[PDB]
Amino acid sequence: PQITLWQRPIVTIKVGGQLKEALLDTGADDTVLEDMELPGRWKPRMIGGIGGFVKVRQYDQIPIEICGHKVIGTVLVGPTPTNIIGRNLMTQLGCTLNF
Amino acid sequence: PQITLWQRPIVTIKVGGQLKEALLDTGADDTVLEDMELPGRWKPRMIGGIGGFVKVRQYDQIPIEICGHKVIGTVLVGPTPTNIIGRNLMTQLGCTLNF
Numbered sequence: 001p002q003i004t005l006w007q008r009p010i011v012t013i014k015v016g017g018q019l020k021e022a023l024l025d026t027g028a029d030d031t032v033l034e035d036m037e038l039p040g041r042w043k044p045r046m047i048g049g050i051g052g053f054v055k056v057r058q059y060d061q062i063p064i065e066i067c068g069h070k071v072i073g074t075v076l077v078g079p080t081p082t083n084i085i086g087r088n089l090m091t092q093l094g095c096t097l098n099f
Numbered sequence: 100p101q102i103t104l105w106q107r108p109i110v111t112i113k114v115g116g117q118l119k120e121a122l123l124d125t126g127a128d129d130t131v132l133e134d135m136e137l138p139g140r141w142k143p144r145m146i147g148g149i150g151g152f153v154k155v156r157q158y159d160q161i162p163i164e165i166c167g168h169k170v171i172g173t174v175l176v177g178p179t180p181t182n183i184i185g186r187n188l189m190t191q192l193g194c195t196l197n198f
């Protein structure tokens with residue numbers, strides 16, 4: 001699809017069998033989800049956002065279906081205003097910015 | 100242009116007489132630039148995300164040239180770690196996300 005930016009580019013994702021809304025966020029290097037249970041071991045990761053650097057949990061090779069497309073990659077979990085799909089997974093979708 | 104997302108989507112802008120680089124960010128509702136002088140009246144605002152919150156000054160109707168295209172809109176200024184072009188200016192470019 002082609003998504004304009006007059007509203008937030010919120011899409012529906014499926015992760016761990018649950019549908020959730022998430023924001024397609026080209027200013028986010030990584031994908032960060034609100035607290036949820038994910039499989040496997042995690043490791044610590046420090047990420048930078050608008051208010052500073054914060055430690056989150058990093059899970060690897062997590063499948064997510066975004067608009068019906070299946071991606072698999074690193075997902076971080078920690079405090080966040082919303083579920084954020086960053087460039088690590090948008091590149092798997094083939095997403096580009098166009099003007 | 101069509102900009103892929105393997106790297107951060109950084110472009111050159113010109114604002115308030117100053118040339119700088121900024122991030123095209125579909126996850127940012129409004130443009131926020133690192134602290135600088137802008138003309139005119141402003142209003143205090145708080146913006147929040149992964150760092151927590153930062154206080155900014157909101158300037159209205161500020162002209163910015165982005166990749167040579169002249170656009171106009173609200174510009175927030177404050178201690179952001181990076182210059183961010185948000186949706187409020189990306190729409191004026193006719194910028195879409197496509198996959």
Ligand SMILES: CC(C)CN(C[C@@H](O)[C@H](Cc1ccccc1)NC(=O)O[C@H]1CCOC1)S(=O)(=O)c1ccc(N)cc1
Nearest residue numbers: 027028029030048049050126127128129146147148149
């Ligand atoms: C978190 C989203 C919902 C909101 N932010 C936009 C995001 O793109 C934000 C932009 C950014 C890049 C690098 C350093 C600092 C900030 N990237 C971000 O945090 O990347 C993290 C999350 C995982 O990957 C790394 S914002 O900066 O808080 C924001 C809020 C309001 C306005 N008007 C403008 C900006």
